[PDB]
Amino acid sequence: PYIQERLKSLNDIETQLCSMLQEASQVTFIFGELKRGNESVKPQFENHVKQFYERLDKSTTQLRKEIQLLDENVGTRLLPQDTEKMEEQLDLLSAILDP
Amino acid sequence: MFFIKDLSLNITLHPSFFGPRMKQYLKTKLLEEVEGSCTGKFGYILCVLDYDNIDIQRGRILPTDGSAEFNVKYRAVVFKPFKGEVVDGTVVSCSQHGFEVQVGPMKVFVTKHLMPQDLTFNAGSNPPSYQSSEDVITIKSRIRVKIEGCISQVSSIHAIGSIKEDYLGAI
Amino acid sequence: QALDAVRMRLAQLTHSLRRIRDEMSKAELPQWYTLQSQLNVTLSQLVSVTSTLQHFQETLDSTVVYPLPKFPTTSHESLVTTLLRKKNIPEVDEWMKYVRETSGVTTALLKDEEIEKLLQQDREITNWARTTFRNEYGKHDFPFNVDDVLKFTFTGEK
Amino acid sequence: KAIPKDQRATTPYMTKYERARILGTRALQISMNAPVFVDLEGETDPLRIAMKELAEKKIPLVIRRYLPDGSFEDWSVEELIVDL
Amino acid sequence: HNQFECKGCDNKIDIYQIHIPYAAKLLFQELMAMNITPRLYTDRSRDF
Amino acid sequence: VSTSTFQTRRRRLKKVEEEENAATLQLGQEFQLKQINHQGEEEELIALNLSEARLVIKEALVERRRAFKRSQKKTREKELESIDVLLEQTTGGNNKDLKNTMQYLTNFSRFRDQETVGAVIQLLKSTGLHPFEVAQLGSLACDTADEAKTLIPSLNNKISDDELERILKELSNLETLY
Amino acid sequence: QFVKRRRDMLEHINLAMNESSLALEFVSLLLSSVKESTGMSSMSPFLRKVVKPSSLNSDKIPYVAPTKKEYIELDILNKGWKLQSLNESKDLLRASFNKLSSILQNEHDYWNKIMQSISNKDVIFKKLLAIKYG
Amino acid sequence: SNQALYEKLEQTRTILSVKLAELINMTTIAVATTSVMMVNNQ
Amino acid sequence: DELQWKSPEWIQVFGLRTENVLDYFAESPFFDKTSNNQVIKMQRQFYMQLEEELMKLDGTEYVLSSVREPDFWVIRKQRRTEIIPLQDYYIIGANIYQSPTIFKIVQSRLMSTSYHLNSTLESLYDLIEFQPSQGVHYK
């Protein structure tokens, strides 16, 4: 369903955020490495740190759009039977009469 | 300046309000009628103090209609400008005739002729300003004014100010 | 005038501290957001106090503090020594010694020269980091009239 | 100046004029849709309502009795004897 | 416009309203035309 | 319905008596310094400097929010925002007069804390000047005793030139560095 | 035990309290010397009573700042300490990342079983969801 | 009412990014201990 | 600035009094042999009149900034040119008091406060459990 798609998108956004956090950690530790005079991680430090910002930016673009879609869907896809019981019993009854 | 004054208002209640939320309606009717008003006699009645200890007193019932009239005593912070008073404030408007300085609840107008000699209105400036060599006065700057006189218009008090003398002007 | 500001900051900090203790003394403890809020207030205060200390630290390094003739030196000397105690928290200085030993590498000997080269490496690394920050930051973007209808149904006029 | 309750010396009984004015005033207020302090046992005339309120001494009014000097004694309708 | 004024007094503030029989409003205007001042005050100053 | 005062006056029919107001300390008939309490006792005039006025109003508008939630039962830049919150809760909202007064007071106040204000209050009250002058001295920051005696002409000879400079020194120190 | 941990926390925070307060009082008296003027009012009542007015003194020195500028080791100590703090912070952040990741696993499992949760008829209300069956 | 959510979220994003970069600037650069405390805060 | 020097026995071979307090100032580790007093002493070997003698000589000076007998005195270390100071030592209870700053004591204060702040912060920070729907709850 549509709501399922929305929820899936939101979950994806959550995943993105998590990624951002992880690469924040990476960035911190590897900055610690660079300050100590290890430059070998300069490629990997900046990569993880830049991939973080890229991932965070992507999540921001994805999340803000999702919020806009919710506002546009108000009144459209989003809010602002005993005859069924009877058919069940009749079915049940004819089944008893003719097993 | 900026005084605290002991005042009393007369409100009249129609009998239908003679219920349990009476004192409440009265204090409310006081804050409606008095707070944010302005009179030549007291200045701007800005804010009523001690909302809990507003004295409602007893209400004399008028003898024709059943209504009841109270003398609500209250304390308020007021604002009344005086001639000769020196005030800091902000420029809010600035034309070829002078500029207005918003001071508290009231504006004060500084006519182009109570201004330092070389400080003159230049309209090519954006926005139009007063442009001395060591001063530029425009629509957002802070000024110190001396109130040359007040005009009472029982609804507001307007006044006219000078920045010409020593120790005045921009700050 | 500076000492007045310093005393103000210290007073505020003391207040926030007492408040924290008060919140802790209650069994259930306060709403977490409130505790964090007060914590932030304390943060602002202590930042102001450290910046003010440091700004006056040249002027604070400048003086001598001893008891005046009116001080009850006879009865309590110990409280006077406590008030004048310049010894750090033995734990703060034990983790200062522990941090410093753990702080990489970096052993005395040295000697300076080579230590200034180390500091230089740190500073140029800082510059590189700043540039990187600059570029990385560069990489992102910041029908009808109801009355008339009714009137028709009641009188027939269009 | 206002005479203290413990020093009041006017009649403990309600005057004809007082009673006529209380009944007039309540009836007026009752008629201006003021809250009624009694069970209207089917009553509709505000004077008959007023009479009923005064009959049960459920009238929240006070008589400020002025003395020729300007001073006064305040008396509650609840406390005034209605021998009229 | 809620404007009040008693020019000559320059009083735009200390003003009251009263309910009197028009014949008295008349009588008072008449006594004035005849140079007599029937000043009406809403407070007392004598006591007794 | 015109809001009255705490004192009485003889209606001599001659409305032509009112004088002007200046910095000869000739405030109104209303604002003269020997004035009368609601309880009837004669107390002195209360003029507030800003900071002091900013606190009175703030302290009062909060006492009022309390009472409204009771009956419901049955950094300077940051403060400019919080204040506009308090107003929409406690004031009639149409009160543009008060809204500016708070923006003004909040931006022009020299002393932030009630402690600091009290320190000014203490200091300035040994001088026994008019309550109007001590208010001005608390509102207008001055460096020279001339600056003071120029912006507050009401002084001139009430306080010495050097004793007034002592005070401006202690005021400048008490000044809150926002 | 959690409560015991709370006791520890309270203990530490209380120590902080005492220290900073002490500093403030000392400052207060030292100021009570000249200005003040109202500054001495920040002193505790017992302390205020205990000490007669007019306490301590001060002297003039430059060159304590120059001696401080002469010795540059404190800056190096600062850098190192900062680095250490950065490391601890790194570890902690890694931990947070893991925890939040797993939390996201379970929560989105819940949300997926709830995408599977099927219908729009019934009224759902809320920190947990409840349905009105009746 | 959803616009408020959008505003709060955007403000939150800006705050997060800005605080991250600015904290990254704050360290590298008891003063050091104070700096560490500030880092912890951010 | 962090230390306290005491030679409690030095009182015993003399007794502790004013000129004594000066000399006992000389006995403690806080004293410097680069001062003028040491020179005067050595020259003598080979209390007002002392102050009179310090006016002739040029160098660092240590003078008497109090007498409360037999307990307290300030002894001032000053640089004479007009007299500039340096630092101020107190003598109370047969123990030399270190002249600790101004700035350093404040440093101590800040340090301590900050430290325990950190402790509380971490300890409490471990405690909370976070759910997106539940926010932060304390179990």
Curated annotation (Swiss-Prot), chain A:
Chief subcellular location equals: nucleus
Kindly state one GO CC term assigned in the UniProt record.
nucleus
Leftover remarks: Present with 396 molecules/cell in log phase SD medium.
Please report the organism this UniProt entry assigns to the protein: Saccharomyces cerevisiae (strain ATCC 204508 / S288c) (Baker's yeast)
Keywords on record:
Activator, Coiled coil, Nucleus, Transcription, Transcription regulation
What's the reported outcome of changing T28A? Impairs interaction with RAD3, reducing the interaction of TFIIH with the head module and consequently resulting in a reduction of RNA polymerase II CTD 'Ser-5' phosphorylation
Superkingdom of source: Eukaryota
- GO-annotated biological processes: negative regulation of transcription by RNA polymerase II; positive regulation of transcription by RNA polymerase II; positive regulation of transcription elongation by RNA polymerase II; positive regulation of transcription initiation by RNA polymerase II; RNA polymerase II preinitiation complex assembly
The protein's name is Mediator of RNA polymerase II transcription subunit 11
Xref: Pfam families: Med11 (PF10280)
Coiled coil ranges (UniProt) are 53-95
Q: Where in the cell is it found?
A: Nucleus
Swiss-Prot record, chain E:
Cite the binding residues for Zn(2+). Answer: C6, C9
Name its cellular compartments: Nucleus
What functional role does this protein have? DNA-dependent RNA polymerase catalyzes the transcription of DNA into RNA using the four ribonucleoside triphosphates as substrates. Second largest component of RNA polymerases II which synthesizes mRNA precursors and many functional non-coding RNAs. Proposed to contribute to the polymerase catalytic activity and forms the polymerase active center together with the largest subunit. Pol II is the central component of the basal RNA polymerase II transcription machinery.
The annotated subunit structure for this chain is: Component of the RNA polymerase II (Pol II) complex consisting of 12 subunits.
Please tell me what else the database record remarks about this protein.
The binding of ribonucleoside triphosphate to the RNA polymerase II transcribing complex probably involves a two-step mechanism. The initial binding seems to occur at the entry (E) site and involves a magnesium ion coordinated by three conserved aspartate residues of the two largest RNA Pol II subunits.
Q: Which family does it belong to?
A: Belongs to the RNA polymerase beta chain family.
The protein's name is DNA-directed RNA polymerase II subunit RPB2
Record the organism: Saccharomyces cerevisiae (strain ATCC 204508 / S288c) (Baker's yeast)
Which gene carries the instructions for this protein? RPB2
Specify first residue, last residue and whole-protein length for the fragment: 1177 to 1224 of 1224
Swiss-Prot record, chain H:
Where's it found, cell-wise?
Nucleus
Annotated signal sequence range: none
Its domain of life?
Eukaryota
Annotated coiled-coil positions are none
Instruction: Indicate where the modification N-acetylserine is found in the sequence.
Output: S1
Provide the function of this protein.
Component of the Mediator complex, a coactivator involved in the regulated transcription of nearly all RNA polymerase II-dependent genes. Mediator functions as a bridge to convey information from gene-specific regulatory proteins to the basal RNA polymerase II transcription machinery. The Mediator complex, having a compact conformation in its free form, is recruited to promoters by direct interactions with regulatory proteins and serves for the assembly of a functional preinitiation complex with RNA polymerase II and the general transcription factors.
Q: Which family does it belong to?
A: Belongs to the Mediator complex subunit 22 family.
**What else does the entry mention about this protein?**
Present with 2181 molecules/cell in log phase SD medium.
What is the protein's given name? Mediator of RNA polymerase II transcription subunit 22
Q: Which organism is it from?
A: Saccharomyces cerevisiae (strain ATCC 204508 / S288c) (Baker's yeast)
UniProtKB/Swiss-Prot annotation, chain I:
Location in the cell: Nucleus
- The SS bond pairs are none
Report the leader peptide range: none
> Subunit composition?
Component of the Mediator complex, which is composed of at least 21 subunits that form three structurally distinct submodules. The Mediator head module contains MED6, MED8, MED11, SRB4/MED17, SRB5/MED18, ROX3/MED19, SRB2/MED20 and SRB6/MED22, the middle module contains MED1, MED4, NUT1/MED5, MED7, CSE2/MED9, NUT2/MED10, SRB7/MED21 and SOH1/MED31, and the tail module contains MED2, PGD1/MED3, RGR1/MED14, GAL11/MED15 and SIN4/MED16. The head and the middle modules interact directly with RNA polymerase II, whereas the elongated tail module interacts with gene-specific regulatory proteins.
Q: Which family does it belong to?
A: Belongs to the Mediator complex subunit 6 family.
Anything else known: Present with 4824 molecules/cell in log phase SD medium.
| The protein's name in its UniProt record | Mediator of RNA polymerase II transcription subunit 6
Native species: Saccharomyces cerevisiae (strain ATCC 204508 / S288c)
Instruction: Give the encoding gene's name.
Output: MED6
